[PDB]
Amino acid sequence: YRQPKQKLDFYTLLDNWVLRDEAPAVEQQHYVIANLIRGGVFGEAE
Amino acid sequence: VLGGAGTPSACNDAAYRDKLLQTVATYVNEQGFAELARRYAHNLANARF
Amino acid sequence: ILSTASVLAFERKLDPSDALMSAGAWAQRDASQEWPAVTVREKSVRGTISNRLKTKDRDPAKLDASIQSPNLQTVDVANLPSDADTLKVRFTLRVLGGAGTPSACNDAAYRDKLLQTVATYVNEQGFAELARRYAHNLANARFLWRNRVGAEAVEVRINHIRQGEVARTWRFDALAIGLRDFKADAELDALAELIASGLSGSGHVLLEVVAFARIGDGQEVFPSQELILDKGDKKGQKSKTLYSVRDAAAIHSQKIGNALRTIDTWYPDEDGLGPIAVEPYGSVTSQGKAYRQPKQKLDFYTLLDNWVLRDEAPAVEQQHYVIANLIRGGVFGE
Amino acid sequence: ILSTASVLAFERKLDPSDALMSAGAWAQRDASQEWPAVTVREKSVRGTISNRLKTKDRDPAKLDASIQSPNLQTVDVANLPSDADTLKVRFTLRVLGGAGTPSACNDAAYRDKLLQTVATYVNEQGFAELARRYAHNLANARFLWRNRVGAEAVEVRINHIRQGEVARTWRFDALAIGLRDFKADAELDALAELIASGLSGSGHVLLEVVAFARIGDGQEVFPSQELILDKGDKKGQKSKTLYSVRDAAAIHSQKIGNALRTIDTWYPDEDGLGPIAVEPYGSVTSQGKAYRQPKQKLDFYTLLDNWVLRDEAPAVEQQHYVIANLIRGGVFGEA
Amino acid sequence: NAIHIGPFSITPAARGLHYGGLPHHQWTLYYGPREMAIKTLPDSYTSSEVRDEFSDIIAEFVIDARHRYAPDVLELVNSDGDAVLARVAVSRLPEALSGCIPDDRFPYWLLTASRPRLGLPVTLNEYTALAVELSAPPLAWITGLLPGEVLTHDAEEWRPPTSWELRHVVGEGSFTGVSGAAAAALLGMSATNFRKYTAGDSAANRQKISFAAWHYLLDRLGVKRAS
Amino acid sequence: NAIHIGPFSITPAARGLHYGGLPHHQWTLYYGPREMAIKTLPDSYTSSEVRDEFSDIIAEFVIDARHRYAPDVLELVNSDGDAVLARVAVSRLPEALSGCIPDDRFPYWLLTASRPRLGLPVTLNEYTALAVELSAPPLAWITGLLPGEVLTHDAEEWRPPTSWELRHVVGEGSFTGVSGAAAAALLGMSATNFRKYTAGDSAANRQKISFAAWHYLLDRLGVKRAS
């Protein structure tokens, strides 16, 4: 779920929110902050 | 539960770091962690673990 | 016609040991000699596709095929026991003195000029500012790197050990003394006087530093992490290795030494971000950035070459930073 | 007539062994035969660039690129255990005698003149000055090279071992005896008399030297470093190897031997800088400089050629230097 | 009878031996003060055979020094992140780089080839300006073997190169492969006045090359860009 | 009391007159041997006023010489023919050009900006190579005002510039705007040893600049690329 072909994965939502200032729906804001609470390595691939 | 959930532990760009910090700050000021803590408290309440 | 020496190198002062971890209960920390060591165990980790993807690998068939075949690693882990909430971290620290004399130097004239420059620094002010900041980084337990984050109470006992027995004892609450500012105190300035006595060569300073951090029962502690050599991974081989001295989780000595010299507040970029470690081109690995870039005139080499060759003494904070780099040691030559 | 020999070589007197390290607690040091050895471990090291940049103030983005990909290395390290605070370094040194005879020579006339020159040196004065300086370098623990820096208390026990058991014992406080000047002492002159009796050929000298240095619980010791076959780029990681004999950290025998012959105080530059090791064109690598340059007439080769061929006997201090070079041994030939 | 191949020198051991009945000599190959190899070659070997014994070690030195001191590579990519459009070997970095992942807000990006990439959004005219300003000459790796105070543009800190440093770039055995005659013709001098630079000691009529002549020579040999 | 502004010289007429009751002198502005203007300026004019009388004619000369000797412009376009992607001022043409109209068989073309276009299909890596090789420095138009035998790379045909040709590029009134001190610091030379080049006659201790120093100076001033 949240395939990147749809515009709802964490990376596209974070890039639209931070770079382009297009803040998503408040549910997706909860999802992005839940991903930031989860932690992880969000950098370039490979 | 620790807190400080917006600050990265390692970053390249300082400008992107400041923009991300202020974006999480505007999220927190619009609404707190209450919805997320409500769902985490539910997952603590039902023994999903 | 005085030029820099082509060979020039300094041994380090402030030698720490490897910090050993043990575990026990809070308020048993006054009888903390029989506390059992924190051991490093292994556990299995099943991951998932969670990093970024290239655009050539974002087709849904390829993504679901990658999710259906997961990665299975083995990971070294270190936790407190389930009946103990306090991590104890113990090491020893020698303060040595003789901080101006290079261990190897080409020119005799440059050696004499550098020695007299450090001598005029010492005569104008002692090591008291630097030793105050070093005693701060001992007092607040900054050498607990991630073990300090989110703890209830951190308490540091420092024993100055003259003969085989204790000569003096300090006790600090490391959360009162912040990681941000360098204040004053009676016991902290007594410790700073001892460290400056060691750095000046007027004594022999050996301290034993013990930190207690109240974490929680069975929580994860973070020792130093080693480096793996992968040669065609042996059916999901180990992906994380932790340092251990002899079945006891430990922190590398240069990690403790990097946390000790986190005293540089004089870098030109900002001052509300905190102190950093004294390095030439003062660089933070987590930030990926060099404060004191050499295109500004505030790295170690331009300040040292202006102070020594051309007698342009910098500001007293930059003089503090240059003498801190000489205390840190290094290979400063071509 | 009487040119110098084309090949000429001397075997060394004062042969030391490899000095082994072990660890224990101070005031147990008289029972220190079962002390466990100091072992060499590995640790990982991550570091940034602290050397001088080649392009000095240009290219500030390359510096930030190099911080984001730092140097990872594996490094051999040796420490004391966390409950031991005393390092113990043990070796055996034997003094032989026969310091004038080369082991290889071309001319018989040159070796006869050289043997007669050394015989007149020994007949004028004994080895008493040289043996006093060697006993001083045994008395202070100079052979602890960096393990002596910043030590709390250093104590040296020297056993003259005649048969399989101990014949005589010396006990020195190595921090009292400085690394600077050559004092006098009754025990030190007894040791110097033993060393001079060994150098004169009038006896067989075997000593066992044990040094104890009080450092600290778990502090770092410094054995000898081995050579690395440019494995900093291909395999990349192993960037320091330490010498070890049988799973026990050790110092090389020639390191101990270099510390023993640090007796040369007569070099023409100064003598407030301390003694240096005896060497032809007496040179310190850590200073990158040659004292006793051959432009001045005070290196070993010109002094030997004037003393042997042209009979120009130098001053008594330079004669001590030349005989110290002959005790050191080496390949002194046309190269 | 030493042999000089650029900065390398092959010297014999001043007294031979008899191996297998035949007289031999030990030849040592040095790169300046650092001893690189020793071989035991017979007498009745011509100097071409002595050169071709050590030619393999010299060639492996050249291979390693060429790979080690290779200049950096910037890549011009499109907005997705893959699909390299152009590459340029630079001798410096564009000073505004800071770690970036390319998105579709701009159609052209300039990344480092090193893996935690730095990058910058460009628009094919400032890319051309950066490539013209910062490009590397075809023999920039020889600058890795030079002391760095003979390569500086600051005239106060510059010191002239020695004869051994001068033999890295000028000579038939040098890494540029340019003779003294061709390098004299590049500087507008005669071959004798240029051979005055390559003597070795200041007594035997050796003067030092000047700042402008050295930097123009490094420009014309294709070693340093010297803008 | 002549006035020198770079290559220009303003000289008075050696006997004045009385215009309107006041004493005047005729000042002539020369560019070398060619007489550019004559004015009749009063006495009790300071030399700054005499300079600012002819500054407009000097500025129009600079404008015309900058527009006339402007270097060529190549354009990188896509496959249709319109929609310029990049421009590059070159000092030479890429030697493989021959009159072309871009079609869609290749996606990138390199045309001349001059109207019967020449062009070449490129692929953004050889475009970068051509732009690095053939680009023009920011003050290339000063090469239009120079004799061409002082700009040649052939050392057999090169002759050193005179003091008047040297004043086009070095001096406070020159077209580069670079003083003699800054040009001495560019060449790693003392201001006096560099002022020895700018005397004018060979008797008054004037030596000629060398080939390497002249071409390196033209490289460092941004006049000739000097590859």
Q: What does the alpha-carbon distance between residue D95 and residue E157 come to, in Å, rounded to a whole number?
A: 54
Per the CB < 8 A criterion, the answer to whether C229 and D237 are in contact is yes
Per the CB < 8 A criterion, the answer to whether D162 and D149 are in contact is no
CB < 8 Å to C55, chain E: 80-82
Q: What does the alpha-carbon distance between residue F191 and residue F185 come to, in Å, rounded to a whole number?
A: 8
Structure tokens, C130? 């630097």
C-alpha dist (Å) from residue D79 to C327, D104, D141, E214: 21, 44, 19, 52
Q: What does the alpha-carbon distance between residue C20 and residue C6 come to, in Å, rounded to a whole number?
A: 39
Q: What does the alpha-carbon distance between residue D198 and residue D130 come to, in Å, rounded to a whole number?
A: 12
Per the CB < 8 A criterion, the answer to whether C139 and C128 are in contact is no
Domain boundary among C262, C277, C297: C262
* A4 and chain C in contact, CB less than 8 A: yes
Q: What does the alpha-carbon distance between residue E93 and residue E100 come to, in Å, rounded to a whole number?
A: 15
- If we measure between CA atoms, which residue out of E27, E23, E24, E26 comes closest to residue E9? E27
* Nearest chain B alpha carbon to A15: B20
The type of residue at E41 is: L
The type of residue at E155 is: A
Are C167 and C291 members of one domain? Answer: no
Are D143 and D217 members of one domain? Answer: yes
User: Which of C53, C60, C63 comes nearest A45 by C-beta?
Assistant: C53
- If we measure between CA atoms, which residue out of D182, D106, D103, D79 comes closest to residue D140? D182
- If we measure between CA atoms, which residue out of F75, F124, F83, F121 comes closest to residue F102? F121
Q: What does the alpha-carbon distance between residue C329 and residue C100 come to, in Å, rounded to a whole number?
A: 10
C-alpha dist (Å) from residue D9 to C101, C325, D12: 39, 47, 10
DSSP E197: G
- If we measure between CA atoms, which residue out of F44, F135, E227, C105 comes closest to residue E218? E227
Distance from the Cα of A12 to chain B's closest Cα (Å) equals 14
- How was this structure determined? It was done by cryo-EM
* E34 and chain A in contact, CB less than 8 A: no
Q: What does the alpha-carbon distance between residue F45 and residue F39 come to, in Å, rounded to a whole number?
A: 13
Are C333 and C184 members of one domain? Answer: no
- Residue D148: helix, strand or coil by DSSP? coil
Exposed (0-12), middle (13-18) or buried (19+): which is E115, by Cβ within 10 Å? exposed
Say if the Cβ atoms of F213 and E217 lie within 8 Å.
no
Say if the Cβ atoms of E118 and D65 lie within 8 Å.
yes
Per the CB < 8 A criterion, the answer to whether F212 and E213 are in contact is yes
Q: What does the alpha-carbon distance between residue F4 and residue B12 come to, in Å, rounded to a whole number?
A: 55
- DSSP character string of F143-201: GGGS-SSSS-S-TTT-----HHHHTTTSSTTSSS---HHHHHHHTT--HHHHHGGGSSS
Rg (CA), chain D: 23
Distance from the Cα of E50 to chain C's closest Cα (Å) equals 34
Question: Of chain A residues 15-34, which have a CB less than 8 A from chain B?
Answer: 17-19, 26, 29-30, 33-34
Say if the Cβ atoms of E105 and A15 lie within 8 Å.
no
Structure tokens, C243? 């340092």
Structure tokens, C3? 């030029």
CB < 8 Å to D59, chain E: 92-93, 95
Q: What does the alpha-carbon distance between residue C95 and residue A40 come to, in Å, rounded to a whole number?
A: 40
- For D165-192, b/e burial (b = at least 16 CB within 10 A) is eeeeebebebbebeeeebeebeebeebb
Question: Which helix or strand (DSSP H or E) is residue E49 part of?
Answer: helix E47-68
Per the CB < 8 A criterion, the answer to whether D258 and D279 are in contact is no
* Nearest chain A alpha carbon to E82: A45
- DSSP character string of C188-255: HHHHHHHHHHHHTTSS-EEEEEEEEEE--TTPBP---B-----SS-SSS-EEE-B-BSSSSBEE-HHH
Strands D71-77 and D289-290: unpaired
Per the CB < 8 A criterion, the answer to whether D56 and D98 are in contact is no
Q: Which domain holds residue D280?
A: 1-11+99-126+263-335
Distance from the Cα of E46 to chain C's closest Cα (Å) equals 40
Q: F9-18 contacts: CB < 8 A, separation 24 or more?
A: F10/F50, F10/F51, F10/F54, F16/F43
Q: What does the alpha-carbon distance between residue C294 and residue D49 come to, in Å, rounded to a whole number?
A: 13
Are C115 and C137 members of one domain? Answer: no
| Total number of domains in chain C | 2
- If we measure between CA atoms, which residue out of C323, C304, C300 comes closest to residue C3? C304
Are D225 and D150 members of one domain? Answer: yes
Q: What does the alpha-carbon distance between residue A3 and residue A5 come to, in Å, rounded to a whole number?
A: 5
Are D40 and D105 members of one domain? Answer: no
- For F110-122, b/e burial (b = at least 16 CB within 10 A) is bbbeeeebbbbeb
Alpha helices in D200-329 (DSSP H): 253-260, 300-308, 316-328
Main-chain phi, psi angles of F171, to 5 degrees:
135, 160
Are C170 and C131 members of one domain? Answer: yes
Are C329 and C216 members of one domain? Answer: no
- If we measure between CA atoms, which residue out of C304, C228, C226 comes closest to residue C10? C304
- Residue C281: helix, strand or coil by DSSP? coil
Under 8 Å CB-to-CB from E70, ≥6 apart: which residues?
E89, E141
Q: What does the alpha-carbon distance between residue C325 and residue D50 come to, in Å, rounded to a whole number?
A: 10
Domain boundary among C227, C262, C297: C262
Q: What does the alpha-carbon distance between residue F127 and residue F110 come to, in Å, rounded to a whole number?
A: 8
Are C227 and C270 members of one domain? Answer: no
Q: What does the alpha-carbon distance between residue D49 and residue C333 come to, in Å, rounded to a whole number?
A: 13
- Strand extents, DSSP E, chain E: 3-5, 8-12, 17-19, 22-31, 34-42, 72-77, 84-90, 109-112
Pseudo-torsion of CA F13, F15, F20, F26, nearest 10°? Answer: 0
Are D121 and D216 members of one domain? Answer: no
Q: What does the alpha-carbon distance between residue C24 and residue C5 come to, in Å, rounded to a whole number?
A: 52
- If we measure between CA atoms, which residue out of C9, C211, C209, C200 comes closest to residue C95? C200
Domain boundary among C201, C235, C262: C262
User: Which of C108, C204, C294 comes nearest D150 by C-beta?
Assistant: C204
Rg (CA), chain B: 14
Interhelix angle A10-18/B14-30, rounded to 10 degrees, is 100
Q: What does the alpha-carbon distance between residue E51 and residue E165 come to, in Å, rounded to a whole number?
A: 21
User: Which of C50, C51, C53 comes nearest A4 by C-beta?
Assistant: C53
- If we measure between CA atoms, which residue out of E55, E213, D269, C304 comes closest to residue F211? E213
Structure tokens, D186? 């009754």
Which of B11, B12, B20 is the best mutation test for E, with the most CBs of E within 10 A?
A: B12
Under 8 Å CB-to-CB from D208, ≥6 apart: which residues?
D90, D91, D92, D158, D159, D161
Are C151 and C195 members of one domain? Answer: yes
- If we measure between CA atoms, which residue out of C72, E81, C67 comes closest to residue A2? C67
Are C258 and C270 members of one domain? Answer: no
Counts for chain B of helices (H) and strands (E), in that order: 2, 0
Q: What does the alpha-carbon distance between residue C325 and residue C320 come to, in Å, rounded to a whole number?
A: 9
Per the CB < 8 A criterion, the answer to whether E24 and E38 are in contact is no
DSSP D29: G
